[PDB]
Design a protein around this ligand. Structure first.
Ligand SMILES: [Mg+2]
Ligand SMILES: [Mg+2]
Ligand SMILES: [Mg+2]
Ligand SMILES: [Mg+2]
Ligand SMILES: [Mg+2]
Ligand SMILES: [Mg+2]
Ligand SMILES: [Mg+2]
Ligand SMILES: [Mg+2]
Ligand SMILES: [Mg+2]
Ligand SMILES: [Mg+2]
Ligand SMILES: [Mg+2]
Ligand SMILES: [Mg+2]
Ligand SMILES: [Mg+2]
Ligand SMILES: [Mg+2]
Ligand SMILES: [Mg+2]
Ligand SMILES: [Mg+2]
Ligand SMILES: [Mg+2]
Ligand SMILES: [Mg+2]
Ligand SMILES: [Mg+2]
Ligand SMILES: [Zn+2]
Lengths: 84, 51, 54, 116, 177
RNA sequence: CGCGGGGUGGAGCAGCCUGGUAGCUCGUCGGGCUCAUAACCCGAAGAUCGUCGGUUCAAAUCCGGCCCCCGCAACCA
RNA sequence: CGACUUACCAACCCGAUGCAAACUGCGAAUACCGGAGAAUGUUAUCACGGGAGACACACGGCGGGUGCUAACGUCCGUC
RNA sequence: CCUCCUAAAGAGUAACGGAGGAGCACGAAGGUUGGCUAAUCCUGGUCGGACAUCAGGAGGUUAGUGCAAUGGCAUAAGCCAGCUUGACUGCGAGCGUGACGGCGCGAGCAGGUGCGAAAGCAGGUCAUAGUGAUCCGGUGGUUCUGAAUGGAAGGGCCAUC
RNA sequence: UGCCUGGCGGCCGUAGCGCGGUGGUCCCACCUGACCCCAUGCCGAACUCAGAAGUGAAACGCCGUAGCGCCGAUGGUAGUGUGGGGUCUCCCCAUGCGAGAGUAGGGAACUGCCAGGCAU
């Protein structure tokens, strides 16, 4: 009861945050090849003029303005590039 | 780890070689592939060799 | 320090209005006495409520 | 169901074409008739349509459900597309195995002039 | 196709008159006949499964499919993908041929045959019956039977209910009891 | 209290570190030799692995705790 | 070889109740990103270059972890 | 180093805070074309049962995803089969993310290939872990240099240990 | 123009499920038969081919049904930005935003293009 006892912990591990999430939001004007959203799995899908990379990163394939819309029978979320 | 490293040398006589990893024990048979050879700019047979 | 502690007891956070104990099949006055006896063992102010249609 | 399986089969190539923006020559094969349509990339406008169900095509055919009826209808749809200046389309087999009547229609259209 | 002709000419009439079906197409048919044998002993000697499949091929005139494990089971010491049975599906012409052969030859050769159960309709109209011995089929030569391979036979039918299914089967002079 | 281990027939130990199955000795039982016993000889059975819960198709084994048994440490003022 | 009950334990489903940081078929306020529009602000913005210091923080309010919903405790976010 | 929470609905965010994993695997588990759809339970059925294979139904993805957890996935990224080497060479608009070293995404262009009738897809795997800078050296190309000249030694550049 | 049917969509449950009924001139489906083209890790089941006797049985289409699923106000409540206040680990006031659930209720989709059939 003098000083203290002791006892190690088994946790204290974690990983570098990956900076996911929407980079360019709706209404923004992107250059071709701009990343619109980095994500894990197609949480967002590739609409018009939008390409999906291997890590499911959505990048604009044409110059223009971003546009999110709920589309399809599963009410999924599609990112499209309106021509500008 | 358990996989060793091998180089696939060109059979076109360029001396060019790709490199890759192979499981020696489970696939003892050598590995042959048609891979592009930049030196002769043609797809040619590449066969396995030690690194 | 040196980590978290060990679990010692389990509680149930109580917010005002939560109906803790319910009772049926007894007279109202005896229910009041029983609930008084029970509330005497709890660290929260209580009150006696009845059933209503809505 | 057979048609449910067919729709599930078709949907992938249909979506690929729909995003690519190709004018679509969609076929539809039944045990008796074989239909062909050419449809705008938006999907809601029927450019041309040739089918064995209609007299102009059927009256030159013995049976409307075989490779020769398919060749006739493919020839007709390709010529009407060339008269509308459609020129360049892409083939939507709608899940049907590209073989037999569907393939015969495709070759008839290709020789008549539709490019796919 | 003898029993197929018998079906289309007499069994259809019986069923129409009996169940008052409004459409002729409402009368039950025989969709398929599946002959299975679960060679659970293949896990020790794989060759046993090949020989059992040879016996089934002899019975059916039709090379069998080697059905494998759907999921690994340790209670029977089978891993996923281990072949543990062989099956054949018979339709149409060979359907009817095997069906007639069974009814009019193999069932009589059953040792101590008293009558097939009428309780083996799986609630819809499918008849599943178990044959203990492959010697009841003359297609198998007795003298080379290294081992008593059984099998089980499933007559799959377009009947909605067991009543209609068994009426259809009995109209084929099927030996119930 | 921390850290390293251990829990396996009736007793003492292996096995387990490389998940696909539990052995050795003594003991116990039955018979045999002996007038009888001991020793001895010949046969047999016996534990489902501390325990809970997971993982896995499969747990004595891997894992997490829990219970008990040893060992080291629990210091500087 | 062959069958009864109960004293009880209780799965699924149906209905009625609650709870959750590692639960969500719902879901704000704020904050954030982008665009346009006035006014205001000694360009308050960005780039480049010369010189630095600083990298021991403290308390208070709001949202929290840890602690005993203890500490002028400790570790965070934002003022 | 990877995953979830704390983390306060953009990003980021600490603790000797709460939970788990990695130091790989695969020549196919990659590419493409064609095809297919799960768990579980109930009913019937030779050995054979609670759990083996067969048939039907209910169910609805409660399955699967080579390995952790999350996010995904029916057009399947899940399961078979054919042919295969794009698990290519030189670049790369534009972005994202970092103090920096660096790391990631990437249409498109050139060459030459695979699959498909074709549109088209393919410069690895459903994604996020599977790893170490520099120096010093080793191996193979490269006549770039090669101390008087011609070579060579050595050094450089490219691939790689 | 009307109505039925087939195809391609729009949209993604006010659109799905259940239950009851109804349709075969046309369409569609079941169907008939496999030198064939093509095919099953066996099977003309499926894919495919040559057809058309029969039936709308199943499926599909349509119609009617509220038993569900679904949508859903007004009001109140919770939370909350800014500024204050309290016996302050929680609250209250002024002002701005204002749900979720639930209630009334709605609800058996609607709609474009082309083709065919019938009555015109
Ligand atoms: Mg930390
Ligand atoms: Mg939450
Ligand atoms: Mg410092
Ligand atoms: Mg500091
Ligand atoms: Mg500090
Ligand atoms: Mg600080
Ligand atoms: Mg503060
Ligand atoms: Mg909170
Ligand atoms: Mg605080
Ligand atoms: Mg302090
Ligand atoms: Mg301090
Ligand atoms: Mg955040
Ligand atoms: Mg925030
Ligand atoms: Mg893979
Ligand atoms: Mg793949
Ligand atoms: Mg993976
Ligand atoms: Mg010299
Ligand atoms: Mg040199
Ligand atoms: Mg509401
Ligand atoms: Zn006789």
């Amino acid at each position: 009861a003098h000083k203290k006892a002791g006892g190690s912990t088994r946790n204290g591990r974690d990983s570098e945050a990956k900076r996911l999430g929407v980079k360019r939001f709706g209404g923004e004007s992107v250059l071709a090849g701009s990343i619109i959203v980095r994500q894990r799995g197609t949480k967002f899908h590739a609409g018009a003029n939008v390409g999906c990379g291997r890590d499911h990163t959505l990048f604009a394939k044409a110059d223009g303005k971003v546009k999110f819309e709920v589309k399809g029978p599963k009410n999924r979320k599609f990112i499209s590039i309106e021509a500008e | 780890g358990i996989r060793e490293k091998i180089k696939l040398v060109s059979s076109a006589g360029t001396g060019h070689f790709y490199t890759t990893t192979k499981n020696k024990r489970t696939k003892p048979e050598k590995l042959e592939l048609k891979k592009f050879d930049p030196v002769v700019r043609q797809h040619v047979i590449y066969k396995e060799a030690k690194i | 320090g040196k980590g978290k502690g060990n679990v010692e007891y389990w509680v149930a956070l109580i917010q005002p209005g939560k109906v803790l104990y319910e009772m049926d099949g007894v007279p109202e006055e005896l229910a009041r006495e029983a609930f008084k006896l029970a509330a005497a063992k709890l660290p929260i102010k209580t009150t006696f409520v009845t059933k209503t249609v809505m | 169901d057979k048609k449910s399986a067919r729709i599930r089969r078709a949907t992938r190539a249909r979506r690929k074409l729909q995003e690519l923006g190709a004018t679509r020559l969609v076929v539809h094969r039944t045990p008796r008739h074989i239909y062909a349509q050419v449809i705008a990339p938006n999907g809601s406008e029927v450019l041309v349509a040739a089918s064995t169900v209609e007299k102009a095509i059927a009256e030159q055919l013995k049976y409307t459900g075989n490779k020769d009826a398919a060749a006739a209808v493919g020839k007709a749809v390709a010529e009407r597309a060339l008269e509308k200046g459609i020129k360049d389309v892409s083939f939507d087999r709608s899940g049907f195995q590209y073989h037999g009547r569907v393939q015969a229609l495709a070759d008839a259209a290709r020789e008549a002039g539709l490019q796919f | 196709a003898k029993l197929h002709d018998y079906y289309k000419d007499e069994v259809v009439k019986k069923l129409m008159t009996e169940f008052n079906y409004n459409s002729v197409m409402q009368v039950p048919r025989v969709e398929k006949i599946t002959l299975n044998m679960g060679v659970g002993e293949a896990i020790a000697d794989k060759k046993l499964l090949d020989n059992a499949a040879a016996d089934l091929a002899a019975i059916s005139g039709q090379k069998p499919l080697i059905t494998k494990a759907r999921k690994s089971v340790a209670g029977f010491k089978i891993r996923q993908g281990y072949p543990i049975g062989c099956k054949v599906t018979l339709r149409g012409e060979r359907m009817w041929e095997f069906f007639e052969r069974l009814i009019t030859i193999a069932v009589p050769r059953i040792r101590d045959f008293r009558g097939l159960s009428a309780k083996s309709f799986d609630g819809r109209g499918n008849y599943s019956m178990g044959v203990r011995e492959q010697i009841i089929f003359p297609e198998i030569d007795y003298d080379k039977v290294d081992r008593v391979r059984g099998l089980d036979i499933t007559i799959t039918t377009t009947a909605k209910s067991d009543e209609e299914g068994r009426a259809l089967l009995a109209a084929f002079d099927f030996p119930f009891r």
